[PDB]
Design a protein around this ligand. Structure first.
Ligand code: NA
Ligand code: NA
Ligand code: NA
Ligand code: NA
Ligand code: NA
Ligand code: NA
Ligand code: NA
Ligand SMILES: [Zn+2]
Ligand SMILES: [Zn+2]
Ligand SMILES: [Zn+2]
Ligand SMILES: [Zn+2]
Ligand SMILES: [Zn+2]
Ligand SMILES: [Zn+2]
Ligand SMILES: [Zn+2]
Ligand SMILES: [Zn+2]
Length: 188
């Protein structure tokens, strides 16, 4: 671990971005360096870092057999060391597991810690929204979301910064004290 990959991932291959047909270590490396956003489900090809064989996406290299990722999901085309990831069909992406700690809430439409099942306030597709603090997406973020007792969602980082200046939901102004607050599963 820690020999091959980027700042985001420990992986043995590079993705061929079907948009600009460039080779980037991962979708974040691509998105940080391109006008547009990479569609991870559209990725068809990868290149072995070790032997530069460009090939269809798979867990090991067809020529030299280098291990591309300890965890490999052929839907998101994600490669990584073992972080107990699982791919959730309702989220549509890979989550940081383990899968048994989480359930997918249909209404809020993200994976939530088991202790919130039937024990939180649902807001329709609230996960598919921007964080009201930073106004960047919650659902696909690699930062754990925090369910406020009111059911609104904040990035854990944005939530903890907000506590230095206040203690109320940035949208509905309800206090963050109380029942129904907890953690969601991070994007892998
Ligand atoms: Na490398
Ligand atoms: Na990726
Ligand atoms: Na849906
Ligand atoms: Na999606
Ligand atoms: Na589930
Ligand atoms: Na953020
Ligand atoms: Na995590
Ligand atoms: Zn591109
Ligand atoms: Zn990267
Ligand atoms: Zn190879
Ligand atoms: Zn996946
Ligand atoms: Zn889910
Ligand atoms: Zn819910
Ligand atoms: Zn945020
Ligand atoms: Zn709120």
């Amino acid at each position: 671990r820690g020999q091959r990959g980027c700042e985001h991932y420990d992986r043995g291959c590079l993705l061929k971005a079907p948009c600009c047909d460039k080779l980037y270590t991962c979708r974040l490396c691509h998105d940080n360096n391109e006008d547009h956003q990479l569609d991870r489900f559209k990725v068809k090809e990868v290149q072995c870092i070790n032997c530069e064989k460009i090939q269809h996406a798979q867990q090991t290299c067809e020529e030299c057999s280098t291990l591309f990722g300890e965890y490999y999901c052929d839907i998101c085309h994600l490669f990584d060391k073992d972080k107990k990831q699982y791919h959730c069909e309702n989220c549509g992406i890979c989550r940081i597991g383990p899968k048994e700690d989480f359930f997918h809430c249909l209404k809020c439409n993200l994976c939530l810690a088991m202790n919130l099942q039937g024990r939180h306030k649902c807001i329709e597709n609230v996960s598919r929204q921007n964080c009201p603090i930073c106004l960047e997406d919650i659902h696909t973020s690699r930062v754990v979301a925090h369910v406020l007792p009111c059911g609104h969602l904040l990035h854990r980082t944005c939530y903890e910064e907000m506590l230095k200046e206040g203690y109320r939901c940035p949208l509905c102004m309800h206090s963050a004290l109380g029942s129904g607050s907890g953690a969601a599963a991070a994007a892998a």
